[PDB]
Amino acid sequence: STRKAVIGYYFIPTNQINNYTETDTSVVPFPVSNITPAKAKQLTHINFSFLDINSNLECAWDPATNDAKARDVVNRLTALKAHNPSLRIMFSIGGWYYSNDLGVSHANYVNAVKTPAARTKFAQSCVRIMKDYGFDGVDIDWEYPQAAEVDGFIAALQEIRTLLNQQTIADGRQALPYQLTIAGAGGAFFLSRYYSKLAQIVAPLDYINLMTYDLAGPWEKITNHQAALFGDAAGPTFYNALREANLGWSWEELTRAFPSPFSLTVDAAVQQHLMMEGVPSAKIVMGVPFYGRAFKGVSGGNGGQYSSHSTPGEDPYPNADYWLVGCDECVRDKDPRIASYRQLEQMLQGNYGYQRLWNDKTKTPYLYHAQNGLFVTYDDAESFKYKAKYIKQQQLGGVMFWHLGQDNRNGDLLAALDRYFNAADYDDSQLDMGTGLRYTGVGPGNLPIMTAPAYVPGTTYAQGALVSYQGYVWQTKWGYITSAPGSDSAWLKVGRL
Numbered sequence: 022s023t024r025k026a027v028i029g030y031y032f033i034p035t036n037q038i039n040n041y042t043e044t045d046t047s048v049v050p051f052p053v054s055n056i057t058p059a060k061a062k063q064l065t066h067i068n069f070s071f072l073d074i075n076s077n078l079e080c081a082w083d084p085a086t087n088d089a090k091a092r093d094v095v096n097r098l099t100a101l102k103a104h105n106p107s108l109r110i111m112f113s114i115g116g117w118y119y120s121n122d123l124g125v126s127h128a129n130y131v132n133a134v135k136t137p138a139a140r141t142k143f144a145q146s147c148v149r150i151m152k153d154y155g156f157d158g159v160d161i162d163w164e165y166p167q168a169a170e171v172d173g174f175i176a177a178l179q180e181i182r183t184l185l186n187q188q189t190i191a192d193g194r195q196a197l198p199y200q201l202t203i204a205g206a207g208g209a210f211f212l213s214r215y216y217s218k219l220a221q222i223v224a225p226l227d228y229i230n231l232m233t234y235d236l237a238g239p240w241e242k243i244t245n246h247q248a249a250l251f252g253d254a255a256g257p258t259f260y261n262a263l264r265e266a267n268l269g270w271s272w273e274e275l276t277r278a279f280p281s282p283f284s285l286t287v288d289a290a291v292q293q294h295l296m297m298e299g300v301p302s303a304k305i306v307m308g309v310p311f312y313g314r315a316f317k318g319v320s321g322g323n324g325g326q327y328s329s330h331s332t333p334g335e336d337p338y339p340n341a342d343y344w345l346v347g348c349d350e351c352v353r354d355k356d357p358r359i360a361s362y363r364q365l366e367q368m369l370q371g372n373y374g375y376q377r378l379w380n381d382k383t384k385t386p387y388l389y390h391a392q393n394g395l396f397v398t399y400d401d402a403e404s405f406k407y408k409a410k411y412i413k414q415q416q417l418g419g420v421m422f423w424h425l426g427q428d429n430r431n432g433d434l435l436a437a438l439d440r441y442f443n444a445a446d447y448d449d450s451q452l453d454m455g456t457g458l459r460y461t462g463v464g465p466g467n468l469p470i471m472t473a474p475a476y477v478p479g480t481t482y483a484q485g486a487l488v489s490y491q492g493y494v495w496q497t498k499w500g501y502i503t504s505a506p507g508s509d510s511a512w513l514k515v516g517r518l
């Protein structure tokens with residue numbers, strides 16, 4: 022069996038690069054030296070983030086970046102490869118701040134992919150940056166192209182792919198070829214922007230790293246788990262926006278693929294990808310958060326889950342009330358709404374009044390502060406057992422996480438992921454996946470194996486009848502049908518032999 026990818030973001034802001042030091046955590050909280058040899062061996066990829074696209078429509082460092090310091094920080098990451106010959110140091114272009122619809126560089130993303138000439142110039146700059154700084158591949162985190170941008174974006178990925186392949190040959194890197202990945206939407210609403218062209222988007226990639234987290238946040242009316250593996254029938258449900266994608270499918274095909282409303286979960290996003298023909302499970306990487314999302318003003322009853330709340334949604338955080346009791350990092354970062362797993366462990370250990378609770382449907386933990394009305398949705402080594410098992414069972418390519426600086430000091434989240442995939446003595450064959458709600462959609466890419474009596478010409482088939490014919494199992498949509506399955510619109514392809 023081939024090794025699961027373990028992809029960790031390394032995020033460092035420009036001011037920290039410009040003042041880079043390994044001996045002052047109040048200037049750089051998580052320097053490269055915290056990535057020990059043992060961590061380096063547990064990772065397959067580190068995604069250095071974030072570069073940007075400039076107004077010249079080229080991949081570029083933030084213009085305030087000190088170049089010598091940048092090279093130095095990158096050199097420190099690539100030196101980690103000494104401990105792990107499989108390890109790649111990628112760089113990521115984009116992120117939410119640079120690339121969101123209202124982000125500071127958004128128009129550069131749109132314009133870079135818009136014409137053949139712009140794509141060539143952009144693609145070349147990506148490979149030039151990669152070679153200049155010693156990176157091992159390119160990750161694109163544009164959140165998110167839409168509409169006519171999608172065709173440009175696909176052409177841009179195809180062109181970057183060809184240039185990476187040229188570079189792999191030029192460098193004799195066939196043992197560790199240069200790679201191309203993107204960070205993909207992990208929820209139907211954003212995914213619907215490019216969903217109909219998913220196979221084309223994924224074809225040029227080594228992996229699509231699904232952002233299957235941030236599925237709950239202060240923008241929602243109701244608290245919820247941000248990365249539930251499976252659904253909880255007591256939780257909120259959402260309109261399935263994919264059924265409105267430009268797919269050209271029939272009513273029955275849409276309905277069978279896109280139940281609505283549906284539970285917004287990791288399993289939903291993964292299945293939504295697998296339903297598409299030409300999207301291989303081995304390219305799908307499951308993102309997990311190394312941080313929790315915190316809400317205030319929540320009611321009692323169900324541990325703070327699925328409650329109204331009074332958490333500000335504005336950015337930046339609009340006042341100086343840091344109400345996440347015990348979160349020192351929140352004070353430092355002026356935002357009580359996000360806490361690293363590292364910080365959450367300390368909050369749980371201190372005398373701050375949190376209970377750690379567990380939802381056995383979603384297979385995720387949450388903190389509840391009964392006295393102040395606080396709710397925190399996060400992941401730990403325990404929720405990772407179910408996710409890693411799901412990853413193995415669904416034959417996904419691996420796991421990605423945001424971000425390395427958020428693991429605890431011992432790096433237990435990373436070590437847990439590595440152990441669940443690679444430890445000879447770890448056994449999850451008996452781990453019970455629970456009865457949480459599964460996403461049941463079936464599309465052309467994930468037909469189940471089925472059997473049925475062979476189709477017989479001259480027979481009149483009632484609605485709902487199942488037959489096998491030319492490699493597939495088919496179901497009549499109404500009765501009485503006598504046509505050969507697949508030859509007109511009366512038959513639904515429901516399974517494969």
Ligand SMILES: CNC(=O)NC(=N)NCCC[C@H](NC(=O)C[N-][N+]#N)C(=O)N(Cc1ccccc1)Cc1ccccc1
Nearest residue numbers: 030116117118162164204232235239312334336358359423
């Ligand atoms: C590798 N790429 C990603 O992981 N991308 C990603 N998570 N994109 C969506 C995130 C949107 C943004 N996310 C975070 O703050 C993640 N936190 N961490 N760690 C987000 O939640 N908001 C948009 C934003 C954030 C910062 C600056 C500008 C815009 C809204 C928000 C609401 C409440 C607290 C923090 C952010």
